[PDB]
PDB file of C-alpha atoms in Angstrom:
ATOM      1  CA  UNK N   1     -21.748 130.468  86.146  1.00  0.00           C
ATOM      2  CA  UNK N   2     -21.515 130.762  82.302  1.00  0.00           C
ATOM      3  CA  UNK N   3     -19.440 133.900  82.594  1.00  0.00           C
ATOM      4  CA  UNK N   4     -16.982 130.968  82.109  1.00  0.00           C
ATOM      5  CA  UNK N   5     -17.344 131.085  78.274  1.00  0.00           C
ATOM      6  CA  UNK N   6     -15.177 133.866  76.706  1.00  0.00           C
ATOM      7  CA  UNK N   7     -16.953 135.161  73.520  1.00  0.00           C
ATOM      8  CA  UNK N   8     -15.704 134.695  69.876  1.00  0.00           C
ATOM      9  CA  UNK N   9     -15.102 138.512  69.532  1.00  0.00           C
ATOM     10  CA  UNK N  10     -12.516 139.370  72.275  1.00  0.00           C
ATOM     11  CA  UNK N  11     -10.655 135.993  72.515  1.00  0.00           C
ATOM     12  CA  UNK N  12      -6.830 136.040  72.971  1.00  0.00           C
ATOM     13  CA  UNK N  13      -5.203 132.576  72.824  1.00  0.00           C
ATOM     14  CA  UNK N  14      -2.924 131.723  69.764  1.00  0.00           C
ATOM     15  CA  UNK N  15      -4.852 131.662  66.522  1.00  0.00           C
ATOM     16  CA  UNK N  16      -2.473 128.686  65.841  1.00  0.00           C
ATOM     17  CA  UNK N  17      -2.925 125.040  66.949  1.00  0.00           C
ATOM     18  CA  UNK N  18      -0.618 123.775  69.842  1.00  0.00           C
ATOM     19  CA  UNK N  19       1.549 120.636  69.328  1.00  0.00           C
ATOM     20  CA  UNK N  20      -0.677 119.013  71.952  1.00  0.00           C
ATOM     21  CA  UNK N  21      -3.971 120.092  70.373  1.00  0.00           C
ATOM     22  CA  UNK N  22      -2.724 118.514  67.098  1.00  0.00           C
ATOM     23  CA  UNK N  23      -1.589 115.289  68.832  1.00  0.00           C
ATOM     24  CA  UNK N  24      -5.010 115.074  70.628  1.00  0.00           C
ATOM     25  CA  UNK N  25      -7.052 115.939  67.523  1.00  0.00           C
ATOM     26  CA  UNK N  26      -5.220 113.369  65.425  1.00  0.00           C
ATOM     27  CA  UNK N  27      -5.509 110.773  68.222  1.00  0.00           C
ATOM     28  CA  UNK N  28      -9.178 111.496  68.948  1.00  0.00           C
ATOM     29  CA  UNK N  29     -10.131 111.424  65.279  1.00  0.00           C
ATOM     30  CA  UNK N  30      -8.075 108.293  64.596  1.00  0.00           C
ATOM     31  CA  UNK N  31      -9.731 106.628  67.644  1.00  0.00           C
ATOM     32  CA  UNK N  32     -13.205 107.647  66.421  1.00  0.00           C
ATOM     33  CA  UNK N  33     -12.367 106.575  62.767  1.00  0.00           C
ATOM     34  CA  UNK N  34     -10.910 103.295  64.200  1.00  0.00           C
ATOM     35  CA  UNK N  35     -14.094 102.466  66.039  1.00  0.00           C
ATOM     36  CA  UNK N  36     -16.163 102.896  62.775  1.00  0.00           C
ATOM     37  CA  UNK N  37     -17.169 106.589  62.954  1.00  0.00           C
ATOM     38  CA  UNK N  38     -18.226 108.351  59.707  1.00  0.00           C
ATOM     39  CA  UNK N  39     -15.201 109.815  57.806  1.00  0.00           C
ATOM     40  CA  UNK N  40     -15.621 113.355  56.351  1.00  0.00           C
ATOM     41  CA  UNK N  41     -12.799 113.118  53.832  1.00  0.00           C
ATOM     42  CA  UNK N  42     -12.542 110.976  50.758  1.00  0.00           C
ATOM     43  CA  UNK N  43     -10.011 108.223  51.686  1.00  0.00           C
ATOM     44  CA  UNK N  44      -8.052 108.017  48.520  1.00  0.00           C
ATOM     45  CA  UNK N  45      -7.272 104.361  49.279  1.00  0.00           C
ATOM     46  CA  UNK N  46      -6.244 105.211  52.852  1.00  0.00           C
ATOM     47  CA  UNK N  47      -6.520 102.585  55.672  1.00  0.00           C
ATOM     48  CA  UNK N  48      -4.555 103.724  58.778  1.00  0.00           C
ATOM     49  CA  UNK N  49      -6.908 105.698  61.078  1.00  0.00           C
ATOM     50  CA  UNK N  50      -4.070 108.100  61.808  1.00  0.00           C
ATOM     51  CA  UNK N  51      -3.391 108.604  58.074  1.00  0.00           C
ATOM     52  CA  UNK N  52      -7.206 109.092  57.549  1.00  0.00           C
ATOM     53  CA  UNK N  53      -7.268 111.576  60.510  1.00  0.00           C
ATOM     54  CA  UNK N  54      -4.316 113.452  59.109  1.00  0.00           C
ATOM     55  CA  UNK N  55      -6.180 113.749  55.724  1.00  0.00           C
ATOM     56  CA  UNK N  56      -9.275 114.968  57.696  1.00  0.00           C
ATOM     57  CA  UNK N  57      -7.084 117.665  59.459  1.00  0.00           C
ATOM     58  CA  UNK N  58      -5.373 118.571  56.169  1.00  0.00           C
ATOM     59  CA  UNK N  59      -8.758 119.260  54.568  1.00  0.00           C
ATOM     60  CA  UNK N  60     -10.020 120.952  57.811  1.00  0.00           C
ATOM     61  CA  UNK N  61     -13.020 118.511  57.684  1.00  0.00           C
ATOM     62  CA  UNK N  62     -12.648 117.546  61.421  1.00  0.00           C
ATOM     63  CA  UNK N  63     -15.890 118.467  63.272  1.00  0.00           C
ATOM     64  CA  UNK N  64     -14.190 118.859  66.675  1.00  0.00           C
ATOM     65  CA  UNK N  65     -13.669 122.026  68.745  1.00  0.00           C
ATOM     66  CA  UNK N  66     -10.927 122.682  71.377  1.00  0.00           C
ATOM     67  CA  UNK N  67     -12.151 124.131  74.692  1.00  0.00           C
ATOM     68  CA  UNK N  68      -9.081 126.121  75.915  1.00  0.00           C
ATOM     69  CA  UNK N  69      -9.177 126.482  79.688  1.00  0.00           C
ATOM     70  CA  UNK N  70      -7.741 129.533  81.381  1.00  0.00           C
ATOM     71  CA  UNK N  71      -6.282 129.385  84.918  1.00  0.00           C
ATOM     72  CA  UNK N  72      -9.402 130.984  86.436  1.00  0.00           C
ATOM     73  CA  UNK N  73     -11.589 128.325  84.777  1.00  0.00           C
ATOM     74  CA  UNK N  74     -12.868 130.427  81.922  1.00  0.00           C
ATOM     75  CA  UNK N  75     -12.438 129.234  78.293  1.00  0.00           C
ATOM     76  CA  UNK N  76     -12.170 130.081  74.628  1.00  0.00           C
ATOM     77  CA  UNK N  77     -13.554 127.460  72.167  1.00  0.00           C
ATOM     78  CA  UNK N  78     -11.654 127.172  68.909  1.00  0.00           C
ATOM     79  CA  UNK N  79     -12.637 125.033  65.990  1.00  0.00           C
ATOM     80  CA  UNK N  80     -10.172 122.671  64.313  1.00  0.00           C
ATOM     81  CA  UNK N  81     -11.516 124.290  61.090  1.00  0.00           C
ATOM     82  CA  UNK N  82     -10.254 127.822  62.192  1.00  0.00           C
ATOM     83  CA  UNK N  83      -6.927 127.034  63.868  1.00  0.00           C
ATOM     84  CA  UNK N  84      -3.707 127.668  61.851  1.00  0.00           C
ATOM     85  CA  UNK N  85      -1.672 124.437  61.545  1.00  0.00           C
ATOM     86  CA  UNK N  86       2.005 125.625  61.057  1.00  0.00           C
ATOM     87  CA  UNK N  87       3.815 122.813  63.089  1.00  0.00           C
TER      88      UNK N  87
ATOM     89  CA  UNK L   1      40.922 164.843 112.388  1.00  0.00           C
ATOM     90  CA  UNK L   2      40.636 161.470 114.318  1.00  0.00           C
ATOM     91  CA  UNK L   3      37.307 159.536 113.860  1.00  0.00           C
ATOM     92  CA  UNK L   4      34.885 162.477 114.060  1.00  0.00           C
ATOM     93  CA  UNK L   5      35.754 163.153 110.400  1.00  0.00           C
ATOM     94  CA  UNK L   6      34.665 159.602 109.426  1.00  0.00           C
ATOM     95  CA  UNK L   7      31.461 159.825 111.588  1.00  0.00           C
ATOM     96  CA  UNK L   8      30.512 163.073 109.741  1.00  0.00           C
ATOM     97  CA  UNK L   9      31.243 161.455 106.297  1.00  0.00           C
ATOM     98  CA  UNK L  10      29.082 158.442 107.337  1.00  0.00           C
ATOM     99  CA  UNK L  11      26.219 160.733 108.534  1.00  0.00           C
ATOM    100  CA  UNK L  12      26.401 162.822 105.305  1.00  0.00           C
ATOM    101  CA  UNK L  13      26.336 159.559 103.194  1.00  0.00           C
ATOM    102  CA  UNK L  14      23.230 158.427 105.174  1.00  0.00           C
ATOM    103  CA  UNK L  15      21.558 161.859 104.821  1.00  0.00           C
ATOM    104  CA  UNK L  16      21.933 161.653 100.981  1.00  0.00           C
ATOM    105  CA  UNK L  17      20.199 158.246 101.009  1.00  0.00           C
ATOM    106  CA  UNK L  18      17.304 159.754 103.108  1.00  0.00           C
ATOM    107  CA  UNK L  19      16.912 162.579 100.528  1.00  0.00           C
ATOM    108  CA  UNK L  20      17.275 159.988  97.638  1.00  0.00           C
ATOM    109  CA  UNK L  21      14.624 157.737  99.257  1.00  0.00           C
ATOM    110  CA  UNK L  22      12.271 160.645  99.988  1.00  0.00           C
ATOM    111  CA  UNK L  23      12.554 161.868  96.303  1.00  0.00           C
ATOM    112  CA  UNK L  24      12.107 158.257  95.071  1.00  0.00           C
ATOM    113  CA  UNK L  25       8.926 157.958  97.226  1.00  0.00           C
ATOM    114  CA  UNK L  26       7.407 160.685  95.042  1.00  0.00           C
ATOM    115  CA  UNK L  27       8.354 163.779  97.017  1.00  0.00           C
ATOM    116  CA  UNK L  28       9.756 167.119  95.885  1.00  0.00           C
ATOM    117  CA  UNK L  29      13.527 166.897  96.314  1.00  0.00           C
ATOM    118  CA  UNK L  30      15.882 168.670  93.883  1.00  0.00           C
ATOM    119  CA  UNK L  31      18.928 166.831  92.459  1.00  0.00           C
ATOM    120  CA  UNK L  32      20.994 169.613  94.075  1.00  0.00           C
ATOM    121  CA  UNK L  33      19.410 168.666  97.493  1.00  0.00           C
ATOM    122  CA  UNK L  34      20.705 165.096  97.039  1.00  0.00           C
ATOM    123  CA  UNK L  35      24.099 166.056  95.432  1.00  0.00           C
ATOM    124  CA  UNK L  36      24.880 168.329  98.469  1.00  0.00           C
ATOM    125  CA  UNK L  37      28.703 168.249  98.965  1.00  0.00           C
ATOM    126  CA  UNK L  38      30.326 167.180 102.266  1.00  0.00           C
ATOM    127  CA  UNK L  39      31.934 170.626 102.820  1.00  0.00           C
ATOM    128  CA  UNK L  40      28.481 172.246 102.282  1.00  0.00           C
ATOM    129  CA  UNK L  41      27.016 169.706 104.818  1.00  0.00           C
ATOM    130  CA  UNK L  42      29.498 170.656 107.632  1.00  0.00           C
ATOM    131  CA  UNK L  43      28.745 174.304 106.720  1.00  0.00           C
ATOM    132  CA  UNK L  44      24.993 173.805 107.419  1.00  0.00           C
ATOM    133  CA  UNK L  45      24.802 171.329 110.379  1.00  0.00           C
ATOM    134  CA  UNK L  46      28.074 171.669 112.430  1.00  0.00           C
ATOM    135  CA  UNK L  47      28.094 173.615 115.783  1.00  0.00           C
ATOM    136  CA  UNK L  48      30.632 175.831 117.753  1.00  0.00           C
ATOM    137  CA  UNK L  49      33.649 173.761 116.504  1.00  0.00           C
ATOM    138  CA  UNK L  50      32.444 171.119 113.953  1.00  0.00           C
ATOM    139  CA  UNK L  51      30.323 168.418 115.671  1.00  0.00           C
ATOM    140  CA  UNK L  52      27.162 167.261 113.812  1.00  0.00           C
ATOM    141  CA  UNK L  53      23.867 168.883 114.922  1.00  0.00           C
ATOM    142  CA  UNK L  54      21.250 166.253 113.885  1.00  0.00           C
ATOM    143  CA  UNK L  55      18.393 168.281 115.537  1.00  0.00           C
ATOM    144  CA  UNK L  56      18.576 170.753 112.574  1.00  0.00           C
ATOM    145  CA  UNK L  57      18.823 168.040 109.821  1.00  0.00           C
ATOM    146  CA  UNK L  58      15.105 167.150 110.361  1.00  0.00           C
ATOM    147  CA  UNK L  59      12.984 168.231 107.363  1.00  0.00           C
ATOM    148  CA  UNK L  60       9.507 168.208 105.784  1.00  0.00           C
ATOM    149  CA  UNK L  61       8.911 167.113 102.149  1.00  0.00           C
ATOM    150  CA  UNK L  62       5.865 167.549  99.934  1.00  0.00           C
ATOM    151  CA  UNK L  63       4.429 165.312  97.154  1.00  0.00           C
ATOM    152  CA  UNK L  64       5.445 166.271  93.565  1.00  0.00           C
ATOM    153  CA  UNK L  65       2.679 167.462  91.199  1.00  0.00           C
ATOM    154  CA  UNK L  66       2.881 164.058  89.429  1.00  0.00           C
ATOM    155  CA  UNK L  67       2.548 162.125  92.750  1.00  0.00           C
ATOM    156  CA  UNK L  68      -0.816 163.764  93.559  1.00  0.00           C
ATOM    157  CA  UNK L  69      -2.425 162.793  90.194  1.00  0.00           C
ATOM    158  CA  UNK L  70      -1.469 159.110  90.822  1.00  0.00           C
ATOM    159  CA  UNK L  71      -1.878 159.217  94.668  1.00  0.00           C
ATOM    160  CA  UNK L  72      -4.084 162.199  95.706  1.00  0.00           C
ATOM    161  CA  UNK L  73      -4.390 161.263  99.407  1.00  0.00           C
ATOM    162  CA  UNK L  74      -0.582 160.805  99.756  1.00  0.00           C
ATOM    163  CA  UNK L  75       0.196 163.723 102.065  1.00  0.00           C
ATOM    164  CA  UNK L  76       3.286 165.513 103.377  1.00  0.00           C
ATOM    165  CA  UNK L  77       6.100 163.562 105.070  1.00  0.00           C
ATOM    166  CA  UNK L  78       8.252 164.528 108.074  1.00  0.00           C
ATOM    167  CA  UNK L  79      11.841 163.227 108.548  1.00  0.00           C
ATOM    168  CA  UNK L  80      13.502 163.491 112.045  1.00  0.00           C
ATOM    169  CA  UNK L  81      17.142 162.822 113.046  1.00  0.00           C
ATOM    170  CA  UNK L  82      18.056 162.606 116.788  1.00  0.00           C
ATOM    171  CA  UNK L  83      21.334 163.900 118.363  1.00  0.00           C
ATOM    172  CA  UNK L  84      20.996 161.397 121.261  1.00  0.00           C
ATOM    173  CA  UNK L  85      22.325 157.866 120.296  1.00  0.00           C
ATOM    174  CA  UNK L  86      19.400 156.309 122.255  1.00  0.00           C
ATOM    175  CA  UNK L  87      15.855 157.575 121.553  1.00  0.00           C
ATOM    176  CA  UNK L  88      13.631 157.669 124.635  1.00  0.00           C
ATOM    177  CA  UNK L  89       9.844 158.178 125.037  1.00  0.00           C
ATOM    178  CA  UNK L  90      10.628 161.729 126.405  1.00  0.00           C
ATOM    179  CA  UNK L  91      12.094 162.684 122.943  1.00  0.00           C
ATOM    180  CA  UNK L  92       9.845 160.360 120.876  1.00  0.00           C
ATOM    181  CA  UNK L  93       6.501 161.809 122.140  1.00  0.00           C
ATOM    182  CA  UNK L  94       7.668 165.324 120.953  1.00  0.00           C
ATOM    183  CA  UNK L  95       7.909 163.939 117.356  1.00  0.00           C
ATOM    184  CA  UNK L  96       4.617 161.882 117.543  1.00  0.00           C
ATOM    185  CA  UNK L  97       2.553 165.011 118.454  1.00  0.00           C
ATOM    186  CA  UNK L  98       4.300 167.054 115.681  1.00  0.00           C
ATOM    187  CA  UNK L  99       2.851 164.581 113.084  1.00  0.00           C
ATOM    188  CA  UNK L 100      -0.586 164.760 114.817  1.00  0.00           C
ATOM    189  CA  UNK L 101      -0.623 168.615 114.887  1.00  0.00           C
ATOM    190  CA  UNK L 102       0.751 169.333 111.343  1.00  0.00           C
ATOM    191  CA  UNK L 103      -1.815 166.680 110.074  1.00  0.00           C
ATOM    192  CA  UNK L 104       1.074 164.691 108.503  1.00  0.00           C
ATOM    193  CA  UNK L 105       0.432 161.538 106.490  1.00  0.00           C
ATOM    194  CA  UNK L 106       3.828 159.849 107.258  1.00  0.00           C
ATOM    195  CA  UNK L 107       6.764 160.347 109.675  1.00  0.00           C
ATOM    196  CA  UNK L 108      10.287 158.846 109.379  1.00  0.00           C
ATOM    197  CA  UNK L 109      12.481 158.726 112.504  1.00  0.00           C
ATOM    198  CA  UNK L 110      16.212 158.287 111.747  1.00  0.00           C
ATOM    199  CA  UNK L 111      17.736 156.851 114.956  1.00  0.00           C
ATOM    200  CA  UNK L 112      21.455 156.343 115.790  1.00  0.00           C
ATOM    201  CA  UNK L 113      21.687 153.180 117.994  1.00  0.00           C
ATOM    202  CA  UNK L 114      18.260 152.320 119.487  1.00  0.00           C
ATOM    203  CA  UNK L 115      14.666 153.412 120.122  1.00  0.00           C
ATOM    204  CA  UNK L 116      13.590 152.115 123.589  1.00  0.00           C
ATOM    205  CA  UNK L 117      10.557 149.704 123.653  1.00  0.00           C
ATOM    206  CA  UNK L 118       8.741 152.244 125.923  1.00  0.00           C
ATOM    207  CA  UNK L 119       9.175 154.787 123.053  1.00  0.00           C
ATOM    208  CA  UNK L 120       8.351 152.086 120.400  1.00  0.00           C
ATOM    209  CA  UNK L 121       4.803 151.718 121.901  1.00  0.00           C
ATOM    210  CA  UNK L 122       3.985 155.197 120.385  1.00  0.00           C
ATOM    211  CA  UNK L 123       4.522 154.059 116.704  1.00  0.00           C
ATOM    212  CA  UNK L 124       0.923 152.766 115.898  1.00  0.00           C
ATOM    213  CA  UNK L 125      -0.632 155.038 118.625  1.00  0.00           C
ATOM    214  CA  UNK L 126      -1.619 157.860 116.203  1.00  0.00           C
ATOM    215  CA  UNK L 127      -3.445 156.427 113.078  1.00  0.00           C
ATOM    216  CA  UNK L 128      -4.322 156.941 110.136  1.00  0.00           C
ATOM    217  CA  UNK L 129      -0.788 158.484 110.103  1.00  0.00           C
ATOM    218  CA  UNK L 130       1.984 155.856 109.792  1.00  0.00           C
ATOM    219  CA  UNK L 131       5.420 156.021 111.521  1.00  0.00           C
ATOM    220  CA  UNK L 132       8.738 154.566 110.165  1.00  0.00           C
ATOM    221  CA  UNK L 133      11.838 153.747 112.282  1.00  0.00           C
ATOM    222  CA  UNK L 134      15.123 153.701 110.352  1.00  0.00           C
ATOM    223  CA  UNK L 135      18.622 152.990 111.712  1.00  0.00           C
ATOM    224  CA  UNK L 136      21.140 155.636 110.536  1.00  0.00           C
ATOM    225  CA  UNK L 137      23.753 152.843 109.971  1.00  0.00           C
ATOM    226  CA  UNK L 138      21.559 150.983 107.460  1.00  0.00           C
ATOM    227  CA  UNK L 139      21.025 154.228 105.405  1.00  0.00           C
ATOM    228  CA  UNK L 140      24.770 154.944 104.832  1.00  0.00           C
ATOM    229  CA  UNK L 141      24.568 152.953 101.558  1.00  0.00           C
ATOM    230  CA  UNK L 142      21.495 153.301  99.317  1.00  0.00           C
ATOM    231  CA  UNK L 143      20.846 149.580  98.644  1.00  0.00           C
ATOM    232  CA  UNK L 144      18.490 150.482  95.750  1.00  0.00           C
ATOM    233  CA  UNK L 145      21.594 151.620  93.856  1.00  0.00           C
ATOM    234  CA  UNK L 146      23.114 148.057  93.863  1.00  0.00           C
ATOM    235  CA  UNK L 147      23.929 146.150  90.621  1.00  0.00           C
ATOM    236  CA  UNK L 148      21.435 143.357  91.565  1.00  0.00           C
ATOM    237  CA  UNK L 149      18.607 145.652  92.767  1.00  0.00           C
ATOM    238  CA  UNK L 150      16.042 146.271  89.922  1.00  0.00           C
ATOM    239  CA  UNK L 151      13.491 149.098  89.801  1.00  0.00           C
ATOM    240  CA  UNK L 152      10.433 148.591  92.050  1.00  0.00           C
ATOM    241  CA  UNK L 153       7.424 150.794  91.205  1.00  0.00           C
ATOM    242  CA  UNK L 154       4.560 151.303  93.700  1.00  0.00           C
ATOM    243  CA  UNK L 155       1.156 150.704  92.062  1.00  0.00           C
ATOM    244  CA  UNK L 156      -1.987 152.769  92.735  1.00  0.00           C
ATOM    245  CA  UNK L 157      -5.303 151.131  93.866  1.00  0.00           C
ATOM    246  CA  UNK L 158      -6.501 151.508  90.201  1.00  0.00           C
ATOM    247  CA  UNK L 159      -3.146 150.270  88.740  1.00  0.00           C
ATOM    248  CA  UNK L 160      -3.290 147.124  90.997  1.00  0.00           C
ATOM    249  CA  UNK L 161      -7.018 146.507  90.277  1.00  0.00           C
ATOM    250  CA  UNK L 162      -6.170 146.560  86.522  1.00  0.00           C
ATOM    251  CA  UNK L 163      -3.234 144.128  87.062  1.00  0.00           C
ATOM    252  CA  UNK L 164      -5.437 141.528  88.777  1.00  0.00           C
ATOM    253  CA  UNK L 165      -8.213 142.104  86.146  1.00  0.00           C
ATOM    254  CA  UNK L 166      -5.872 141.727  83.129  1.00  0.00           C
ATOM    255  CA  UNK L 167      -4.220 138.488  84.403  1.00  0.00           C
ATOM    256  CA  UNK L 168      -7.497 137.121  86.031  1.00  0.00           C
ATOM    257  CA  UNK L 169      -5.713 137.062  89.417  1.00  0.00           C
ATOM    258  CA  UNK L 170      -6.593 136.745  93.069  1.00  0.00           C
ATOM    259  CA  UNK L 171      -4.068 138.626  95.303  1.00  0.00           C
ATOM    260  CA  UNK L 172      -2.862 135.192  96.608  1.00  0.00           C
ATOM    261  CA  UNK L 173      -1.774 134.203  93.061  1.00  0.00           C
ATOM    262  CA  UNK L 174       0.612 137.187  92.780  1.00  0.00           C
ATOM    263  CA  UNK L 175       4.337 136.664  93.731  1.00  0.00           C
ATOM    264  CA  UNK L 176       4.941 138.248  97.154  1.00  0.00           C
ATOM    265  CA  UNK L 177       7.399 140.726  98.829  1.00  0.00           C
ATOM    266  CA  UNK L 178       7.862 140.766 102.654  1.00  0.00           C
ATOM    267  CA  UNK L 179       6.769 144.054 104.374  1.00  0.00           C
ATOM    268  CA  UNK L 180      10.290 144.053 105.932  1.00  0.00           C
ATOM    269  CA  UNK L 181      12.107 143.523 102.526  1.00  0.00           C
ATOM    270  CA  UNK L 182      14.810 146.262 102.222  1.00  0.00           C
ATOM    271  CA  UNK L 183      13.254 147.706  99.001  1.00  0.00           C
ATOM    272  CA  UNK L 184       9.707 147.389 100.552  1.00  0.00           C
ATOM    273  CA  UNK L 185      10.931 149.550 103.513  1.00  0.00           C
ATOM    274  CA  UNK L 186      12.636 152.073 101.167  1.00  0.00           C
ATOM    275  CA  UNK L 187       9.403 152.678  99.192  1.00  0.00           C
ATOM    276  CA  UNK L 188       7.368 152.674 102.455  1.00  0.00           C
ATOM    277  CA  UNK L 189       5.197 149.773 101.225  1.00  0.00           C
ATOM    278  CA  UNK L 190       2.088 148.980 103.269  1.00  0.00           C
ATOM    279  CA  UNK L 191       0.340 145.518 103.245  1.00  0.00           C
ATOM    280  CA  UNK L 192      -1.476 144.761 100.002  1.00  0.00           C
ATOM    281  CA  UNK L 193       0.433 147.485  98.032  1.00  0.00           C
ATOM    282  CA  UNK L 194       1.663 145.927  94.731  1.00  0.00           C
ATOM    283  CA  UNK L 195       5.108 146.773  93.318  1.00  0.00           C
ATOM    284  CA  UNK L 196       5.943 146.401  89.586  1.00  0.00           C
ATOM    285  CA  UNK L 197       9.527 145.218  89.245  1.00  0.00           C
ATOM    286  CA  UNK L 198      11.323 145.997  85.993  1.00  0.00           C
ATOM    287  CA  UNK L 199      14.547 143.942  85.504  1.00  0.00           C
ATOM    288  CA  UNK L 200      16.740 143.588  82.392  1.00  0.00           C
ATOM    289  CA  UNK L 201      16.530 140.070  80.769  1.00  0.00           C
ATOM    290  CA  UNK L 202      19.053 138.041  78.703  1.00  0.00           C
ATOM    291  CA  UNK L 203      16.043 136.400  77.021  1.00  0.00           C
ATOM    292  CA  UNK L 204      13.718 139.461  76.302  1.00  0.00           C
ATOM    293  CA  UNK L 205      15.497 142.787  76.708  1.00  0.00           C
ATOM    294  CA  UNK L 206      13.427 143.984  79.695  1.00  0.00           C
ATOM    295  CA  UNK L 207      10.996 141.821  81.797  1.00  0.00           C
ATOM    296  CA  UNK L 208       8.364 142.987  84.285  1.00  0.00           C
ATOM    297  CA  UNK L 209       7.343 140.934  87.330  1.00  0.00           C
ATOM    298  CA  UNK L 210       4.974 142.128  90.107  1.00  0.00           C
ATOM    299  CA  UNK L 211       5.266 141.572  93.863  1.00  0.00           C
ATOM    300  CA  UNK L 212       2.437 142.034  96.364  1.00  0.00           C
ATOM    301  CA  UNK L 213       3.291 143.203  99.909  1.00  0.00           C
ATOM    302  CA  UNK L 214       2.733 141.218 103.149  1.00  0.00           C
TER     303      UNK L 214
END
């Protein structure tokens, strides 16, 4: 099935990013950055992959998307770009 | 005076709970019908000197205009009290056929001490109509009135369908209620029927849980 993917219109999870989604985005991006992936932000003299990832997140220039699974197995995909980062 | 006076009080207390329960099920019972005083009770159902005549007590009740819009098939109920402490098949069959003839949906038998297993055979014998056996002694206090007992609300086929839809649920996933649970018995819950329980919360003000029958 692909009744699994919940559409952009009519989506209901928090429009905010979870503490976990942040920890995993920062980690994932720092891991990718750390193993020589192209960086989408201008490192203004930055060198720690986490600090670079944080800059990436701060400028919403992280090209990842969170696939939020529901208990039935369905999902809502949310872009790092669109999620509110209060935290 | 002696103990006949207490036995009458007890019966009257139990009769109120039957009326309360029947109203609560979605039947047409006035508040006056429930709030019937003890002196008015003796007036209606006490014989030649003052002994309770349970044979008379037996009554029919009809679904309220609201109950038919939510549950259209929910038909008229019959409630029967027996003057004999033990209920035999010779007095049980009389009741069973009354439900069959008057095309009744449900029938509640309020028994004093016991209903013989020979008489008990007759309970599922006349479907689709369902029969309920209730011990007089249990009904003296309306348990639903207790501090700790929250409000349980029977959900319609449509109401339940919507519940499962809106939470993407399989019936198995829903928190359960035993078919023999005191409140389940009170509301005359059948298997599969879902009950919406509304309790007060110290966290939110009000919280609603749901329990599926078994």
